Curated annotation (Swiss-Prot), chains A, B:
The chain crosses the membrane at residues 8-28, 107-127, 153-173, 213-233. Changing G230R: In BIBARS; inactive. It comes from Homo sapiens. The chain holds residues 2 to 248 of 374 of the full protein. It catalyses: K(+)(in) = K(+)(out); Na(+)(in) = Na(+)(out). GO terms for molecular function: identical protein binding; metal ion binding; outward rectifier potassium channel activity; potassium channel activity; potassium ion leak channel activity; protein heterodimerization activity; sodium channel activity. GO terms for cellular component: dendrite; mitochondrial inner membrane; plasma membrane; synaptic vesicle. Residues 29-87, 101-106, 174-188, 202-212 are extracellular. Inhibited by extracellular acidification adopting a nonconductive conformation at pH 6.0. Inhibited by phorbol 12-myristate 13-acetate (PMA). This is Potassium channel subfamily K member 9.
Length: 242, 242
C-alpha cells in the first residue's frame, strides 16, 4: 500500500544519505587523522625515550590520567554537579563528563531517565506550543500596527533560532574564552541533544562552585534553546508524523 | 486556562524531580568521588616522585594521552568508522569517541545533522507504527488460536523491550567480554539516545576492520532497538502529545 512504499522510500533515502555522509567524512578526515596519529606517536616516542619510562608503567599512567580527567575540573558530584548531571540525563544530551561508578547509582540513573524522559518531552512540547501561539499573536499585532501564512511563521522561527544560536555563541565565547565558530558549534550540538562531549561548559577553574550566576544563565539558556527547538520541530516536523 | 495550569504543573513536577535526583546523586556519589580523587592523587604523586617527571612535561604527557586516546582503538575514520560516526550523528546518540578536527568538517556535520534528523525521526515513527500493527495482528491470531485491550498491548510492548534488552546485553557480554549488568546498562544507554560514551562498542583490537559480521550485527541490533523504542513511545507517550 501507500504506507509500505513510503517507508521503503524513507529507508532507501536514509541508507543513501548515510553512505554519502560516510564517504564525505572519510575523504575529509582520513589524511588529518593519519597526520595526527603520526605526530602523536612521534611525540610519545620522543618523551618515552627521553624519560626512559617503563612500558608496564606507561599503561598505569594512561589509566590514571584517563580516570583523573574529570577530577581536574573540580568536584563534579556536588549540588551543582548533580543538578547538571540530572539535567543532561533528562534531556538525553549525554555529555559524558561525569558518570556513575556504582551499580546502584547506575540503576537509579536508568530508572530516573525512564521516569523523566516522557515528562520532559511533554513539558517541552507544551512550552513550544505556547511559544508558537505567543509568536503568532505578536506577529498579528505587529502586522496590525504596520491573516498570517505558514511561510511567515517558518521564517520567523528560523530567524529566532539563528538569533538564539548567535546570542549563545557570543555569550559562550565571552565567558569560556572560546572561538566564535567553536562556540556556535558547541551551542548547536547542545541544542540538538547530541552531546559529543568535546566541548563542555562549567568545567574551567571550578566555575560550578564559584560562579552561581553563570550556572544559572547556562541553565536558562539551555532551557530556552530546547524550548525553541521543540517549537520549531512542532511547527515543521510534527506535521509529518500523524 | 487549562493549558496554563497543566504546563505550570509540568514545570513544577520537573523542577521537584530534578531537585530530588540531584540530592540522591550527590548523597550516593560524593564519598566515592572523594575516595577516587584521593587514590588517584596518591598514585600520581608516587609515580611523579619515582620518575622525577618535570611539572611542565606532565601537562604535555596529559595532552598527548588525551588526544591519542581514540587512535589507540585503530583507524576511526575509515569506511566503517565514518559509517558509525554518521549513524551516531543521525540518531542523536553522541558517543564522542571520534570528533571532527576541521572547521569545514564541523560545518558539514552540522548540516548533515540538520538535514538528517527529521528524516530519521519520520522513518522510525513509520517503522514503529508498522511494527505495532504487525504485533496487533499477531496477538489477534494467537488469541484466535487459543478484541484486544490497550493494557495487553502495553504489556506486550514492555515484554518485547525487556527481551530485546536482555538479548543485546547477553550478546555484548559474550562479544566484548563485559559484565551482564554493564552490558545491560550500555544497551539501555544506547537505546535511549543518551550516549554517555563510557562504554563504546567496536573499539577493541580493531574490530571495525577485522569483524564485518560483528559490525553488521551491532548496526542491526541498534536499528531494531531504536525501532522498538519508537514503537513503545508511540504506543504510550505520543497519545499525550496532541
Ligand atoms: C534582547 C536580546 C537581543 C538580548 C538579550 C540580552 C543578553 C545580551 C543578556 C541577557 C542575559 C545575559 C547574561 C546573564 C548572565 C551572565 C553571567 C555573567 O557572569 C558573571 O558576571 C561572572 C563571570 C565573570 O566574571 O565574567 C557574565 C555575563 C552573562 C553571560 C550575561 C551576558 C549577556 C546576556 C546574555
Ligand atoms: C520560572 C522559571 C524561570 C524559574 C527558574 C528557576 C531558576 C531561577 C533556578 C532553577 C535552578 C537554579 C540553580 C540550581 C543550582 C544552583 C547551584 C547553587 O550552588 C550552590 O548552592 C553552591 C555554590 C554557592 O555557594 O553559591 C547556586 C544556585 C544555582 C545556580 C541555582 C540558581 C537558580 C536556578 C537557575
Ligand atoms: C514507561 C514510561 C514511558 C512511562 C512514562 C510515564 C508517563 C505516561 C507520565 C509521566 C509524567 C506524566 C505527566 C505528568 C503531569 C501531567 C500534568 C497533568 O495536568 C493536570 O493534572 C492539570 C490539567 C488537567 O486538568 O488535565 C496532565 C497529565 C500529565 C501531562 C502527565 C501525563 C502522563 C505522564 C507523561
Ligand atoms: C529545517 C529542517 C527541519 C528541514 C527538515 C526536512 C523535512 C521537512 C523533510 C526531510 C525528509 C523528508 C521526508 C523524506 C521522504 C518522504 C517520503 C515521501 O513519500 C513518498 O514520496 C511516497 C508516498 C506518497 O506518494 O506520498 C513523503 C514525504 C517524506 C515523508 C518527506 C517529508 C519531508 C521531510 C521530513
Ligand atoms: C528468537 C530469539 C529469542 C533469538 C534471536 C537469535 C539470537 C540468539 C542471534 C541472532 C543474531 C545473532 C548474532 C549475529 C552475529 C554475531 C557475530 C558473531 O561474531 C563472529 O562470528 C566474530 C567474532 C567471534 O569470533 O566471536 C558472534 C555471534 C553474534 C553476536 C550472534 C549471536 C546470537 C544472535 C544474537
Ligand atoms: C532490509 C535491511 C535489513 C537492509 C540492511 C542492510 C545491511 C545488510 C547493510 C547496511 C550497512 C552495512 C554495513 C556497512 C559497513 C560495513 C563495513 C564494511 O567494512 C569494510 O568494507 C572494511 C572491512 C573489510 O574488508 O571487510 C564491511 C561491511 C559492513 C559491516 C556492512 C555490512 C552490511 C550492512 C549491515
Ligand atoms: K551524547
Ligand atoms: K558523549
Ligand atoms: K566522552
Ligand atoms: K538525544
Ligand atoms: K544524546
Amino acid at each position: 500500500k501507500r504506507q509500505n512504499v513510503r517507508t521503503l522510500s524513507l529507508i532507501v533515502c536514509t541508507f543513501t544519505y548515510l553512505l554519502v555522509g560516510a564517504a564525505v567524512f572519510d575523504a575529509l578526515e582520513s589524511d588529518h587523522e593519519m597526520r595526527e596519529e603520526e605526530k602523536l606517536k612521534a611525540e610519545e616516542i620522543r618523551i618515552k625515550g627521553k624519560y626512559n619510562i617503563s612500558s608496564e608503567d606507561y599503561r598505569q599512567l594512561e589509566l590514571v590520567i584517563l580516570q583523573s580527567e574529570p577530577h581536574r575540573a573540580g568536584v563534579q558530584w556536588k549540588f551543582a554537579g548533580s543538578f547538571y548531571f540530572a539535567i543532561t540525563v533528562i534531556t538525553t544530551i549525554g555529555y559524558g563528563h561525569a558518570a556513575p561508578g556504582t551499580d546502584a547509582g547506575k540503576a537509579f540513573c536508568m530508572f530516573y531517565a525512564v521516569l523523566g524522559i516522557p515528562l520532559t518531552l511533554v513539558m517541552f512540547q507544551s512550552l513550544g506550543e505556547r511559544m508558537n501561539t505567543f509568536v503568532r499573536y505578536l506577529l498579528k499585532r505587529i502586522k496590525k500596527c504596520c491573516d498570517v501564512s505558514m511561510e511567515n511563521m517558518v521564517t520567523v522561527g528560523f530567524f529566532s533560532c539563528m538569533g538564539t544560536l548567535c546570542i549563545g555563541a557570543a555569550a559562550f565565547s565571552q565567558c569560556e574564552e572560546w572561538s566564535f565558530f567553536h562556540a556556535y558549534y558547541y551551542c548547536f550540538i547542545t541544542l540538538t541533544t547530541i552531546g559529543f562531549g568535546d566541548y563542555v561548559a562549567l568545567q574551567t577553574k571550578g566555575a560550578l562552585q564559584k560562579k552561581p550566576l553563570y550556572v544559572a544563565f547556562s541553565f536558562m539558556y539551555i532551557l530556552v534553546g530546547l524550548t525553541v527547538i521543540g517549537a520549531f520541530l512542532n511547527l515543521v516536523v510534527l506535521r509529518f508524523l500523524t
